[PDB]
């Protein structure tokens, strides 16, 4: 599959990507995407992992490169296997084995620092866009919010991240969808974008699925 990844933001974001389930890297692990440019990176099948964009980052003082949201700690735009350092929005997608249904989604299960929209391009199904179009960034409460020193919010964590209960992770004694509902918290995103996930067991979207090896674009501030 091939994964276009275009900036819509009036600044640079750097992308990352990141293959999970212990599988090799895709080629470019981290990008500089300029304000309405685009790149694509190729994904094997079956393939599971996830994708977010970087802000605010800049070569250091000490040449390391370092990113004021969702940095993967590489010092290098590369980011060579590593994740995000929440908060960050995510894509996350699985391609399927031989030809089958992929299922993809916005997560903001990790909170927020860049609206981002995923869509399949070709393939066969359901095939409906996953959205977070909203600069949530805007409307985060103070004990979520993360601060660049112009003052400005730059990012906006979720609840279990920022606090740890298990009614916001869904862990023990929340471990399941029934004990787990959503919370105020979950809802600030819910609201913010209907369009992807706002915790961790929200309600999975049937619609976010696409057979047949579609192609996939992936838009910052969609």
Not at 126 to 139: F, I, L, T, Y
Not at 141 to 164: H, M, N, R, T, Y
């Amino acid at each position: 599959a091939k994964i276009t990844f275009t900036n819509n933001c009036p600044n640079t974001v750097w992308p990352g990507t990141l293959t999970g389930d212990q599988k090799p890297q895709l080629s470019l692990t981290g990008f500089e995407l300029a304000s309405k440019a685009s790149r694509s990176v190729d994904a094997p099948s079956p393939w599971s992992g996830r994708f977010w964009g970087r802000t605010r980052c800049s070569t250091d003082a000490a040449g390391k490169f370092t990113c004021e949201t969702a940095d993967c700690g590489s010092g290098q735009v590369a980011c060579n296997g590593a994740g995000a350092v929440p908060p960050a929005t995510l894509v996350e997608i699985t391609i399927a084995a031989n030809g089958g249904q992929d299922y993809y989604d916005v997560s903001l299960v990790d909170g927020f620092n860049l609206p981002m929209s995923v869509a399949p391009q070709g393939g066969t199904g359901e095939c409906k866009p996953s959205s977070c179009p909203a600069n949530v960034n805007k409307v985060c409460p103070a004990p979520l919010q993360v601060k660049a020193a112009d003052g400005s919010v730059i990012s906006c964590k979720s609840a279990c991240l920022a606090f740890g209960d298990s009614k916001y992770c869904c862990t023990p004694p929340n471990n399941t969808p029934e004990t787990c509902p959503p919370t105020e918290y979950s809802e600030i995103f819910e609201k913010q974008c209907p369009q992807a996930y706002s915790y961790a067991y929200d309600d999975k979207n049937s619609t976010f699925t696409c057979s047949g090896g579609p192609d996939y674009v992936i838009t910052f501030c969609p």
